[PDB]
Design a binder for this molecule. Structure first.
Ligand SMILES: Nc1nc(=O)c2ncc(C(=O)N[C@@H](CO)C(=O)N[C@@H](Cc3c[nH]c4ccccc34)C(=O)O)nc2[nH]1
Length: 268
């Protein structure tokens, strides 16, 4: 007996990765995260957690290595968060935020021999504390991802120190979840992969990561696209960039988290 259906799996390898293979991967992850039910100002909205059936709650991302290793991350479709991962006979899950998330995570990697829930959550602030470094000091790119896949794979066996496991999650979340959320961050990772040059994310990337929920809510609560209150982001060089409307964000944000219902007047 195997419980009805099965979450979707998207594969990516860092071995010989190119801009095109990375673009294909991120497009595929977006396609499994969204349903097409909810698009506002041309920007797709992730499924609403309220009423979402457990059989539609996750996607799997199977990462492989030039080292020939594989780990599978589980993403929550409601927010694209990595909630845990499987390496061979062990799975690890971040500490759940609430009871409903704790139950949901029992539906993942159900026949793994060994199941662990970390005592810590998987938010960036907690993972930065564990890593002993901020996102701004952690290089991203294909080399970092290849290294992170091996670090997650060896964690079971004591090969990987906790600070290196936290830094590995930080790499994976930005190169998969944040790239799915933001075409701008997908483009930043494509640049690092094209030239095979790792580099830490600049303030444009960090301020978008830090503002995804505020931007989703500003767009969803806007009056015909116009924000009641501007949001300040940073350009590459750190200078302030004020966002007053959804229009400037159409090339930048690919997916929003559900924040409010769309008022009458739009997907019809
Ligand atoms: N494991 C993990 N997978 C992710 O994709 C991820 N992506 C982003 C963050 C992160 O700290 N985000 C900041 C900026 O939004 C935050 O304050 N997160 C809070 C609040 C929050 C929870 N769920 C959300 C969904 C959307 C926006 C914000 C939130 C948190 O994780 O507790 N952490 C992640 N951790």
């Amino acid at each position: 007996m195997i419980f009805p259906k099965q979450y979707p799996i998207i594969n990516f390898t860092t071995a010989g990765a190119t801009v095109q293979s990375y673009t294909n991967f991120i497009r595929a992850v977006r396609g499994r995260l969204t349903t097409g039910a909810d698009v506002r100002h041309e920007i797709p909205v992730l499924p609403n957690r309220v009423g979402l059936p457990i059989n539609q709650r996750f996607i799997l991302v199977e990462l492989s290595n030039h080292a020939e290793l594989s780990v599978t991350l589980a993403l929550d479709v409601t927010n694209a968060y990595v909630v845990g991962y499987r390496a061979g006979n062990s799975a690890y899950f971040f500490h759940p935020d609430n009871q409903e998330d704790a139950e949901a995570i029992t539906h993942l990697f159900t026949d793994v021999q060994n199941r662990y829930t970390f005592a810590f959550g998987g938010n960036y602030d907690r993972l930065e504390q564990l890593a002993g470094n901020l996102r701004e000091n952690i290089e991203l790119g294909n080399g970092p991802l290849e290294e992170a896949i091996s670090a997650l794979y060896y964690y079971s066996t004591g090969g990987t120190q906790l600070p290196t496991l936290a830094r590995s999650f930080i790499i994976c979340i930005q190169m998969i979840s944040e790239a799915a959320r933001f075409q701008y961050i997908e483009g930043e990772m494509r640049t690092r992969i094209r030239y095979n040059r790792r580099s830490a994310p600049d303030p444009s990337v960090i301020t978008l990561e830090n503002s995804w929920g505020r931007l989703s809510t500003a767009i969803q609560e806007s009056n015909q696209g116009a924000f009641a209150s501007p949001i300040q982001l940073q350009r590459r060089n750190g200078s302030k960039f004020s966002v007053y409307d959804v229009s400037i964000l159409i090339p930048i944000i690919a997916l929003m988290v559900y924040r409010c219902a769309p008022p009458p007047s739009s997907q019809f």
